[PDB]
């Protein structure tokens, strides 16, 4: 399927144990997609002070359309030293590995895979 319904655990930035997916734009997009498929991906909501506490390159989920079955359609955009790889809508948050942190909420998304 071109899209997959996912429910992403929303994590507090200070709980996150693994603060990024790797060391290159291509690696972090690769790893983010693998973790999304494996159900091992968390979401951090972006506010003042969040991104400097995480590791670049960043992987964002961005709204791709204006929401089947409650699931917002999203796609992945990476960022490294202020350049983004991808073009999309509003940021829903930054993706990180999930390694058992307790979430504060779930974000229902329809991921363009």
Could you name the CATH class? Answer: Mainly Beta
Task: Give the ordered list of helices and strands.
Answer: EHEEEEEE
The proportion of residues forming helix, as a percent range, comes to: 10-25%
Largest sheet: 7 strands, mixed
Calculate Rg over CA atoms. 13 Å
What does this structure look like?
The chain has 113 residues and is mainly beta. It has a single domain, classed as SH3 type barrels. Strands 1, 2, 3, 4, 5, 6 and 7 form a seven-stranded mixed β-sheet that branches. The PDB classes it as viral protein. Keywords: Nsp1, viral protein.
Task: Tell me briefly what this model is.
This is Host translation inhibitor nsp1. With about 110 residues, this protein is mainly beta.
Topology:
Layout: E1 3-10, H1 25-38, E2 41-44, E3 58-63, E4 72-80, E5 83-85, E6 91-97, E7 105-112
Which characteristics define this entry?
monomer; 113 residues; SH3 type barrels; mainly beta
């Amino acid at each position: 399927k071109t899209h997959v319904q996912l429910s992403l655990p929303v994590l507090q930035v200070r709980d996150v144990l693994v603060r990024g997916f790797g060391d290159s734009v291509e690696e972090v997009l690769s790893e983010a997609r693998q973790h999304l498929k494996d159900g091992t991906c968390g979401l951090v909501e972006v506010e003042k002070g969040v991104l400097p506490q995480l590791e670049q390159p960043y992987v964002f989920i961005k709204r791709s359309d204006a929401a089947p079955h409650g699931h917002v359609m999203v796609e992945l955009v990476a960022e490294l030293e202020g350049i983004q790889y991808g073009r999309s809508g509003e940021t829903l948050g930054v993706l990180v590995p999930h390694v058992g942190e307790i979430p504060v909420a779930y974000r229902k998304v329809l991921l363009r895979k």
